[PDB]
Structures are given as C-alpha cells and as structure tokens.
C-alpha cells in the first residue's frame, strides 16, 4: 500500500 | 579641501560561563500520529542509542511498512559540556536524528515539541521548549519529493542569575564540522540524518549578537559641501582607497559591518568568544567623497572588548 | 709578412611579434606587516591607473610620518601598441619604488610580480607570463641618509615560449634612469622620495636571450714565413694609413657592437645595438695590425656584415 | 551574441615514492669563527635529537652571553613513515635559526646542506638521490633597535632531477613555513637570545623542473557574434553566477578551490592547480564564470568548467 | 649471515687544454660614484701589472682620507704554462679586494667580468670562450664598529660550457682561496684602509655543467641472510675488519681521493673530490662497513671502488 | 619609534 | 664588546 | 716627487640679444648671365618665401635642361624669436644651393650677401661672401658637382657702450653637427644647410678659453716632464699618453703640452654649460728619477651676463 | 653645347 | 663625513 | 651539575745551543769479516763525503757479486750552521744501509759509532746497532737485512745545567714516520734520517702538564665521571666517547681518564709553538643522577729560555 | 753458495  | 579623519567604535561581548547540570529532554506533546510512542533511547535497533538520564528523548510514529518506524532522536552532548555554558558561544546542545523509514500513509505526527530541562548553580531549574513541524511526504518514484521535511523553531527561554536576565535561544541545525545553520532538514526514506542543535546564550530578554553603530562622516571635514560614502572594506586598504560595498555586508574576523552612504554603520560581533583575542580590533577602510568629487580615505577601528558578566 | 682583410658576418633577428596589453599582478612575498596589493589608483600613495585590474601595487609598512613604502609597476601597453620588437630594449612599463619611514621590521625581504599577456601566431594566441623576482632591503634608519637609503634588486629572470614552432625568450635586462641608456639591477632610494625606472625586456630566438654574435681568427689568412704572428693593435674603423698599436684583448665598441680580438688572431664581436639602429646594409668595420716574429708590423681590415634576417629566415 | 560554455582539464599526478629515511649534512660554510657541526644532541645548545649519525647542527662565534649562534636541521622521518607524495606539500624537516649574540665579524656568510635518501623505485632497486639546500646568513651588528639586531636567513629554492621507472622526477624546496601556519617564507628575521623554529616545505612532481599542472585556453573561440564584431572578457569570477552575470577581475588572480585563475581580455585564460593532491577529489571540476561583451555593447554570460584529473606515474 | 666484499669504479677525466692567455674585462656595474675601469699599473692604487690591455681593474668612490675602493684581477697566466687540466684546481688570477673610506652612496652594488681566452684543439683551430663572473657589492656604513664597517663581496658559481672534438666541456668558479689555504669562501670581508688578495679557483671538467667524478651502489645487495632483513651499522675509511666498525651511518666519510656517504639501506654515493694531479695511475679507495641481520649478527665486509684516470678522448 |  |  | 692638484677657471657670456627679424640682399656678384635677384616665391624655382621683401635668392644661367642655378637663403625668424643667444650656434637660414645644367659659361664666380636688423635700435648688417664654381659637366658626376665657399666674415657692433662680434661659423647638414665651409652639388639638385653663426664680446669671436702650467706646483728638487694627460678622474690608474693631443671633455678641448703648458677652450654652447660647473682632466707628471705622480687639472667654466 |  |  | 672551565700550563724550551760540526766515528764492532772502517769516500761503494776525517762509514763481508754490506752516515753540518735547538727534530745525518749478498757468515753483528762536537764543551753520543744479515732465499722479503738503532743518550752540561742529547730514530725522509728498525733488500741501500732531539734534565722527557678536571667541578654525596672528551670547543654539542683514548691536539696530545685525571704532553716541534698558543679541549661530564654538562680545558704552552729555568 |  501507499507509504510516507 | 576635504579630508575624512579616522572613526573610533567599541562594543563588548560577555565571555563568561554559567555552570548547568546535565540536561533531560522530554518529548512532551504532539498532533496526530498513529501508534506514537515515546521513550528515553536504547541501543535496539531503531532505539538512538543511549545517554545518562531517564528523560524520553525518542519519539517514533507510524507502522512500517518495510521495517522501522519514522522518528526523531535527542542525545544530549553532556559529556563534552562538562557542566557548563559559554555565553555568546555556539553551544551543542545534543545530536537531534531524523529517523525517516517508510510508513503507511497518513501514520505521521504533523508537530511534537520537545523539553530540555536543566539547573543553574543557588539551583535555578529552568526549561526550553523545542518546537518541530512534520512532513511525512507522500513517497513516490520521486526520491527527492518522497523526502521528509522537519522545521524547528528559534524559541528561547529567558532566566534570571544573580539578579540579572540571560536568554537560551536556538539557533539551528547544522551538519557537524561544516559550520552551515538551517532551519529544515531533508532526510531520504530509509535513512537517518545527525544534525547538531546550535544554542546560544546571552544576557537580556532575548538573544542579540553584540552589536554597534554609528556615523563616519560625522568627524570628516568638507568646505557646505555634502559628503558621500562610495567604498568601505575590511582591512587597511588607505594606500589604494576603496570602492565599491557600500550598503553590503562585510566581514571582518569577528563580525561582520554594512556602511550605508551617508555614514551610518551598524557592526555585528558574530564570532564565538573562543575567538576573540584580549585587546582585540576590527579594522575596516572607508572612502569619502565630497560634493567636488574629490576622494579622501580614512579607517574605522572597532574595539570588541571581552567583560564580564558581573562587568554590567 | 703581409696581413690580409679578413669577412665576417652575424645575423640579427629584426621582426614583430603581435603582443597583447599586459597585466601585472604581484603574487608573492615574504615578512611585510600589513602587506596590501592592488590594482593602481590615484589615491594620493595609490600608485596611478592602468587598463588592467591586475594588482600592480604592492605596499607593506606601518606608517610612521605619512605613507607607507612598497613597489610600483604601470605598464607600457599604450606605446607598445600591441608589438613586442626582437633584440629591441622594450619598456614594458615603469617602476616606482615608494620609500617612506616604516617602524623597524615591517618591511618584506623579497616579493615576486608576474607579467602576462599573449602572443598571436596565425590565428591563435599563446599566453605568457614572465616571472620577476625582487629582494627588498627596508634599512635601519640613522642620520647618514645615504645609509638610511632602502635597496632594491631585480633579478634576470626569463621566460620562453613558443611561436610558429621555434622558441623565443623573453628576458629582463635591468632597470633604467628614463633617458640616461644606464642599466642597472639595484636601485637606492631615500626616505620620503620615489624612484621611477623603466623596465628593459627583450626577446629573442632560442631557449635564452643571447645578444647576436659571431666569431674568427684574423691570422688565418695572414701570410708569415715557419713564422709565428700576432696581433699587437685593434681599433674600430679604418686605420690602415695609420696602422693601429694597443686594445689586444681590450673591448672595442663600433656602431652596432663589441669586439674582443685576442694576441693570437680569435675575435668575437656582439650586436648590442637595437635593431631599429641597424641600417639595411650594415658592415661594422675593425683595424687590426699583425707582427710576424721578424718584427715587421702589417695592418689589414675585418668587415662584419649585419644581416638583418626575419624570425622565417631561421 | 551568445557565450558558449568551456571545458578544459588538467592532469595532477597523484602518486606516492618509497623513500628511506633522510640524512641531512653541513658540507660546506664561508667566513665563519669557531665553526662546528654535528649530529643533534639534547645538549642545552645542541639542537636535538634525530635517527642518524648526520650533521644536522652547526654552529658557529664566540659566544658573549652564552650559547653560539647556528642552523638546526630535524627531520620528520617519522610522520613521513617512508613515503613522499607527489605534488604534495612535504614537511622534509624543521629548520631552527639560532640567534645569539656572537663577538661582531664571528659569523658565517653562507652554508650549504645536503640531504640524502634512497628511493626504492621497481623491484627494490635504491637510487640514491641527495638535495642540496643553500643559505645566506647575515649575523647583523647588534644595536639598541631590536628589529635591525634581528639576523636574517635566506633560503634557496635548489632542486634535485632524479629517475624512477625510466622517468625523471623533481624535489623542490619550496620554503620555510611558520608551523600551523599556511605562509611560505624564503626569508627569516629571528631576534638575539632566541630561536625560530620553521617547516622546511618541499614538494617533488615529473619532469626536468618542478612545476605546478596547468592548462590554457581561450573561452571566446567558441563565442558567437559574426565575423562583423569583436568580443572582449569584461568580467571573470569563481563558481556558477550566471544569473548574475558577472564585471570585474579580468587579468586578476582568481582562486577557486583547487588553484588560481587568470583571465584576459581577449580570452586568454591559464589556470595553475596549486592545492595539495589530498584536496582533489576523485570527480573534482574548477568552475568559473566569464562574461564576454561584443562590440554593440551587448553583454553575455558562460563558464568555463575544468576537470582536474588525478594520474599515476604509470601515466607518462 | 656474511657481508661480501664490493667492488665499485669511478672514472676521472685527467687531460688538459691547450689555453691562451687569459684577458680580464670589467663589463658592467650598477650605482657607483666616479667608477674607473682600467689596464694595471704600478700606480699606488693600480694593482701591479698584467701582459694584456683589457680593464682587469675597477675603482669607484670619492676618497675621503686617500684611495678609491675597487676590485683586483691579475691573471695566472706566467704559471698557467697555455694548458687548462681538467679536474684540477686553476688560479685563474688573483683578486684583490681594495677596501678605503669613501663619501656615502659612492661604491658599486654590483660588477661583472668577463674573462676570455681561445682553446686550440688537435687540429689548432682556435675556440674563443669566455666565462662571466658576477659580483654582489656591500660597501656597509663606517662606524666605530671595525667588523660591522668591514665590505662584502659576494662572488657568484658562473660557468661556460664550449666545445672541444665535439664534446662539451664546462669552465665553473669555485671561489675564494687564501694563497696557500684550501678553504674555498664565495664571500670575503676586507677592513677600511685595507685590501684583500685571494686566488680564484675555477675547475673544468667534461659536460654542460661541472660535476666532480661520482658513482653509486648497495653494499647489502651480495650480502647473505634469510628472509632476514639486514642494516648498515657503521662506516669508515681504510681497512678495518679485525676491529669491524660501529657508527658513521649517513655521515660524511673522507677517504684518499674523495667522500663516501653509506646509507643504512645500503646505499651509498662517493664523490671524487681530489684533484687528479693526487690520484695515482692505479688508485683504489677502500672503506669498510659492518651489517647487522634481524637476529642481531654483526658482520663486516670491505667497499674498494677504482678510480680510473681516462683521457678525453675516452668518452 | 625606531624608523626603518 | 661589540656584538652581532 | 707628488704631482698637486691644480685650478683654473674661465668666463662665457651666457645672456641675450633682442634682435629684429633679419632681412636679406644679395646686392653683388661677378660674371653671371641673366642673373636675377628676387624676394622669394612658390614659383618651382623660387626658394619659398620668407616675411621679408629683401632679395634672398639669386638665380644664374641659361637653362639647358629646365631651371636656372642659384643660392637661396630663407632665415630662421620663426625660431628665433627676436633673440640672439651669445656664444651659441645660431640658425641665422637656411641656404639652399640649386645646381642645374647651364650652358657653358653662364655662371657667375662670386656673389655677396647682406643680412640686417637691429639689435634694441643699433640697426647692423654682415657681409657674405661666397665663391662659385659651375664645373664643366663631363660623364664624372662628382667632377660635375659645383663648389660654394663661404667665407668667416663678421661684423662688429656696439651694445650698452660694449663691443660684440656676429660671425660666420659655416654651413651644417641639418640634424647633424658638422661645419663645413664648402659645398659639393650635384647638377639636377640642391642642397639645403643651416648657416651657423654665433656672436660674442670683442673685436672678433674668440671661444672662451683659460691657460697655465700645470707643474708650477708641483715638487721636486733641481727636472719635471708632463707624460699623460685624459679627460676624467683617473688618479688611482695614472695616464699615459695624449700630451700635445687635443683632449675632449664635457664643454671643451684641452691640450698639455710635455713641460706643463695648457690651454682649454669652451667649445660647447652655453646652453649645455650648467651652472657650477667644472672640467676635470688628469695628468701624470715624472720627474728626472724617473718617478711618475698623477693630479687633476680642475677648471670652473662660469657664466657670466 | 656644353654644359655646367 | 660620512664614510662607507 | 655544572662542569667548570680548567686551565693548565706546560712550559717548552725554546731556546739554541751553538754547536761546531759533528764527526762521526764507527768505534767497535763484533763478528765481522773484513772489516773496515775509513772517511767516507766518492769510490762507488764509498758512503759518499762529508766535511772531516772520521770514519763514518763501515762495511764488512766478501762480496759475492759485487760491493760489501756496511753503514754509512754523512753528517748534516751544511744545514744545522752550528746550531742545536731544543725541543725540536734535528737531522743530525743521514744513515745509508747498504745491503748487499755477502758470503754466509760475513757480517757483523753489533757496531758502535760515536758522534762528536763541542759546545760554546766536547761532548760525546754513543750509537748502538743490531745488525741481521739474514740467510738469503727465495723469499725476497726474508732475505732482507734488519738494523737496529737504540734509544741512546749523552747528559752535557752548559751554563751549570744540564742537557741530554737523546736519538729518537729513523725517519724515511720527507715523512713524519719514526721507526728504530730498519729492512733492506739485498742489493740496495736505504738512506734515513737520523732524528734527535736535546732537551734540558738528565734525559729527555717530552714537556707535559697534568690535573684533575672534575675538582672545580660542582655536584650535589653525588660522584662525577668524565664521559667524554675531544680536541677543540665542543659545548655547544658536548662530546660523548673517547674517555682514556690518546686524543692529538694542534701541540701535543691528551689523555682524560674517567675519574677526571689528565695528562697532555707536548709533542710539537717548538717552531710549530706560536707565542700566546693554547691547547683547547672538550669534556662532558656526568652526575651520578645522569645529567650531562660540558666545560672547556684551556691550557697555555709557554715558550721559555734555558735562562728561565 | 750461500750468501746473507
Ligand atoms: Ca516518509
Ligand atoms: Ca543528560
Ligand atoms: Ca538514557
Ligand atoms: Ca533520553
Ligand atoms: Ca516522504
Ligand atoms: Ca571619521
Ligand atoms: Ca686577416
Ligand atoms: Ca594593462
Ligand atoms: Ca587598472
Ligand atoms: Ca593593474
Ligand atoms: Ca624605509
Ligand atoms: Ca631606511
Ligand atoms: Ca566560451
Ligand atoms: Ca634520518
Ligand atoms: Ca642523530
Ligand atoms: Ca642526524
Ligand atoms: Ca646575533
Ligand atoms: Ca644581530
Ligand atoms: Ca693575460
Ligand atoms: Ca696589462
Ligand atoms: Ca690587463
Ligand atoms: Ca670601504
Ligand atoms: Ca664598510
Ligand atoms: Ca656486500
Ligand atoms: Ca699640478
Ligand atoms: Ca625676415
Ligand atoms: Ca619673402
Ligand atoms: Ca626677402
Ligand atoms: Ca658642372
Ligand atoms: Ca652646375
Ligand atoms: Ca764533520
Ligand atoms: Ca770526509
Ligand atoms: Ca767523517
Ligand atoms: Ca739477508
Ligand atoms: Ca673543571
Ligand atoms: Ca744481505
């Protein structure tokens, strides 16, 4: 999924 | 007919020291983080490695999504502070890290503050807020915008010692050894970034480099007949005269000095005290000019004097 | 016995080299107080202006009644009009030594100056810079003000370069009271007083600057009976009418150069002059008288042509 | 008319020789009284002490107050630990100046060192090489002015050509260095009762002579503006200012951060690596900014960019 | 382990040149008062006497109690016998240092003299040759200090380097000599109302430059060990085995005909320093060195290096 | 004050 | 005496 | 024996006359055909011109060929500025000299010119004489060539109750230095030369100049002889040679004879004479023992008004 | 005929 | 007086 | 620990006795076989000539391919013109050896010779020789003959004072080198000076000064020992090594024992003695703590007459 | 024979  | 005469100045520096007690840094508060946790360092992995107190000096947040969770670190620099503070003397404070792994979005703080506590020797405790905004950035195939963005802020505390105001007041990050003071850092994902955390403190309300001003063309003598600044330089430059610089900033060894044309300066003491001599001078050449067009050059000696803080 | 005129002949370079203006910066030294460089201003000691911002002045000194002392270099590049001329005494600029009363040991020992500028071949340039060393000798002050003088000396130094595949050398030759054609290598200058002195350079082929030359014995031809001869006189000019005793082994000036002729018949005679003082078809003309061991004297000439030839000619 | 941007490059050799330890002689002197040399000692006069059984100290007059006059030598064949570097600062030694007061006229005018190492060149070969280093002196009269009481030193800038692997090789003094400091001297002023300790700098680099790697070109061959107009070089600066396009400095010294520039107004342009090679890195580029003008007046901005390469020796 | 025995060789050029008289020159000068070049004479202030009429003699000053300061060449010549031997000492003349007071400002702070001469090969073709000298001039300040009131002249290591059967060959000042000492001074210092006469040495020898004869070598390189690392521990001139010998590592070492420098590695240079009049038709120089293993073994071996005199025609 |  |  | 030093002096006017412009007549000559004297003109044989109407050129002969022979002189008022110098050389003109083929016998032999102003108004003329020679033209260019002579004429005039004399040095090649007092010409040219003239105090003009013996104070006891003598200070070499020659210096020659006896003539213009001036010369004597000895001869040139 |  |  | 500065002082006589010329006689011998003596002579075997009737040559033995062995010695009266000095090398005659092959048996083996001369005092100096006609053999160097000289003496009087004459040796002429045997090859001669000496006393003793170096010296029960000497100034170094070694200075030599104890013995011809002369020295010595100091050991070498003393 |  999308991360930071 | 016009002949500029030489300019004496002086400014003082307090080149003292305040005797402190280690120092405890306590992550205190902080906005919207998920599974935030805060805790004096370890030598665990992603842990910061340790220092001498029980203060929580680590902060982590988010949930990894490969490996370590997003942080800061605070390892106080007590063992090279020896229980004392300079005064008008870049202090290291600590080693502030930024723990930038890659978390899942939306996981991160947006701000957190920071404690740091200490004493002065008859014991006055006093303490610093350090405040930090966050930006845990979108990670995309653009490494350079996937970075993270911390900003911290020039706060300071003022507290009395022998009846007398002192101002703590930060100055900044800086890459150790390079001299470079910033304000934000950006740091990769997957990957730390050791700054040093430059303090300061002075006498006053808050923190002021030392500083003087004054007029040159107020001694020079002209037919009436206005005058002119059209150059200013460090050094003794009398032989050639000087041209140019007038209104820029100029550095000499212990501060740096803006001649406006029509005589006004303002000098700065920006050095670190370790650097200023006993019986120390700052010499800059400036270059008058009359409404005839005819030059004249004269000096400017600045005596940066060393007092005490009992001194005034 | 009967002495017989004797040929010689020496080749001058006598072209133009297509030259840049020239910038002068001083680079080095050692032990000044205060020492301070700059490109040239009217500033009362500022030295005077140039076309460059090379730093041609150079001061050092704590000024104990007015200025302080230090060099000057203003170059020649406005009158040079873009030509270095070889085997030509060339001002590339003027020297002023400033010399004021400076508290004791603020002076330099020695300071360097570089000259640089380029050099056109056939389009294209070839930049240059000629090293110059200065010891500098800031003395003591007393009441004999001839002691109480500071001392400079320049040295010989040389730089070559390349042009059209052959070398050429450029070479100080010494400093020069404007006007007086004295040379010298040390200057002495009074306290509070200046001293300004063209700077002499030429150029020349080769891999240092040698002045023409040529070489011969004038026995050779001679005829003795076997008999051994020698030459017992030497003068410029003719003097066969005369026929000449005395300067064996002496200097001898002529138009263009020197000659040096030996008791035993070898010569050596050197172009000194500028080539500007070298006429199309020159021949410098010698005397000498020759004794054969019977004592019988005989006076014969030696005619040295000067060719002027271009750098292309070699 | 537009300012093309320029390259050019330099080579810097950035190699390493084995080299023995060094031993330093007083061959020769003039004019001196009661002259003497010797291998240094922890004698209260006697210089220090060294590795060999050279003369490093000499010494000369008949002392009026206590200790003569004289030179020290000491090597620093320790820090070296066998090696030279290649256009590199080396501290060869520290040089002493011994400054007492002697009975006028007990002086010498000069002397001459000599000093000798081995250099192990390919499969252990020693090519023994030796440096000879010369000095004026001048002992000055003593008087109530303690500046001109001072003795001056003058050192030479001798050299030595040496081979290694089918090459040639020179060592250089360079000159005396206050320690610490960054200043060379060829010239020492040292007052009586006192001594003047100094790092004797030299360097070695290939060829006949040593001379600092260079390069030369010109940055307005590749300028356009026609056949029709002329251009000339109105300003020069170190580093990237295009923005700011750039006035002054043309024919100055301009340092960047590996050595020094020079350029004309015509285009003409030399630069000198004058750093030590253990400031170049592996990727090092001296930028510098040009401003050309043509003939209308019309101002343009470029720069000239300069490899500095490191090499081997095996390079030649 | 066991130090062998070296054997080295050094050649020596031990011809001469067939050499005119010498004619002295006085060229140039800078910043004198009154300076006079002249011919000698048997004048008080004139120098003596000569057999050319070139200006070997300068003056300069003002005579402020007498004579005018000035510098002194008298050829060797009469002695010179028209030969130039190669690697030998040469009084090329003797010069004399006349020192008297003169007004302030007045001397010379520089003069250079040309002496010339022609050098006849096997075929007599003359050769003109002429070496410049250069001297540096300080005619210090008079005071009641009689050696701060003493002139220095300084006298420069010129050359001329002039072929000879196509070969060069190259004519080098050594310097000063006080007549019948050996010290070689570059600077003399000479009282007030006093004058100074020194010989000048001068030497040529084959090549662009002048070199004294040298060679080179590693006494350790047929020494036996191992591996066994082995050092130089002392070095001396003669024989001196029974004994062996400790000390003089790196030192200068006098022999016979020249100097050896012996390196603790084993390296070692040795300059023929003699002239070669000294150096006998089957000369050798012998040295002694003493090496020492790891394990701490001394051991001591001999160094005999030839010095071969050769004519000019050989190389 | 000595001059030099 | 005198001394240098 | 010791040779001492010995002193002399001599005086040279060194001050100004205000002169007019100077105005030129040839007024006679001898044996000429169609012989002209005219002011001078820009015609192509005219001479140019002058600020006078004085009659400074004079032509001769028949042309065979184009134009006539003849003498200009065109004077040098422009530079002179209304002064004569004393003791100075002069440009009073420039005379030309037109050499072109002319019949046979057209010449004249001898011609002379006045040349007037006043000297403030004491007006004064010199007379000058020349001779001419027009050669027979033969294939020998140089025997072809005609010969002028001029003559050393003065005249003498009074000023402020004082007497001076203006004369005739000679002609010059301009830009050089050298006197002559005859001209060769080629036919088909002409020659143009300054006429040197220089005026001083006296009945005639006479170079400064200044005697004595040089060995009246030098000792000895009862035979002295004078055996070198040169220009400069060469006491710490001696002299030899050059007695009986004549020795140039700075302002003057000078010459000593063998038994002591010199004379030293000013010869150069005042304006090269600085103030507190002094010739130096040295001479070696010797005495009958044979025993040399050298001085100097130091002699002041003043000038005076 | 002649010339001078 | 001077001398040198 | 500080070395102080030691002075001394040696006088040497430099005074000169006039002498008439010296005769030489060849007195005694043993063992030899035809032995002569005779005033030498320009015969070819002849020893030359000199200026009186002594028989200052010798020779012995039948010669077996030409001349006889024997000495000779021819005065050196030319060039002494009647002077003796004292304290100074006189060649007082060369002594040839002529050795050549004489039949096995034929030489002598000890000989005697006077020399003769008055002093303004007849005076009288015996010389003794061991002879070694050595077998001849194969080995030239073997077969080479071995003279003897001895280290005789005469004790004279003049002026109430005494002197000795006293021989020091051979000398190869022109070197410095003194030996009191002598080797000769067969067929060959060998021509040596014959060096003496004369000084005041009943024998002749070199002049010679002695002291102790560490007595002025200052040191805390703290005991001092020299550790190093050498010739000339040496402080600003100081001198390590060659403590009890023979150390030659410009007039003589110096031996410095480690306790401090010094003996210097002037060995110089005295016309190599300037007046004012002194003999410098360096030694360094050391505390029992072990720190080191260098001082000076001046000592003067006076000239004197025999009327001083 | 033998010979010394
Ligand atoms: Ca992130
Ligand atoms: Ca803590
Ligand atoms: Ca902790
Ligand atoms: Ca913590
Ligand atoms: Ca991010
Ligand atoms: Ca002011
Ligand atoms: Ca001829
Ligand atoms: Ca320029
Ligand atoms: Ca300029
Ligand atoms: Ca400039
Ligand atoms: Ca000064
Ligand atoms: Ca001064
Ligand atoms: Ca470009
Ligand atoms: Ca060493
Ligand atoms: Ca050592
Ligand atoms: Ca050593
Ligand atoms: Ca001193
Ligand atoms: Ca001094
Ligand atoms: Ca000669
Ligand atoms: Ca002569
Ligand atoms: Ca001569
Ligand atoms: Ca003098
Ligand atoms: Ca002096
Ligand atoms: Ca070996
Ligand atoms: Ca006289
Ligand atoms: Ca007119
Ligand atoms: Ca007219
Ligand atoms: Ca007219
Ligand atoms: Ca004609
Ligand atoms: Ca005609
Ligand atoms: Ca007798
Ligand atoms: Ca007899
Ligand atoms: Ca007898
Ligand atoms: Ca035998
Ligand atoms: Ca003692
Ligand atoms: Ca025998």
Known sequence: ?4 | ASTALDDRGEVDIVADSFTVSGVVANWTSWSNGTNVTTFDGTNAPNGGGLDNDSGKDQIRWGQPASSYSSGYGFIDNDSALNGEFALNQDIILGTFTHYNYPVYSGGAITSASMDVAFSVTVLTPVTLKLNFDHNETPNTNNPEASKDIIKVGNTNVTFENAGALYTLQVIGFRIPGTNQIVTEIRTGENATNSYELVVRVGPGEGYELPSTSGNVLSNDVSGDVDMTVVGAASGNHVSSGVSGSVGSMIAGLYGNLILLADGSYTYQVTANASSIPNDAIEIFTYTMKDGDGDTSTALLSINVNRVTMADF
Chains 1, 6, 7, 9, 10, 12 share one sequence.
């Not at chain 1, 999924?1 to 930071?4: A, F, L, V």
Request: proline letters at 0%; a negative charge.
């Open chain 1, 1 to 4: 999924g999308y991360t930071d």
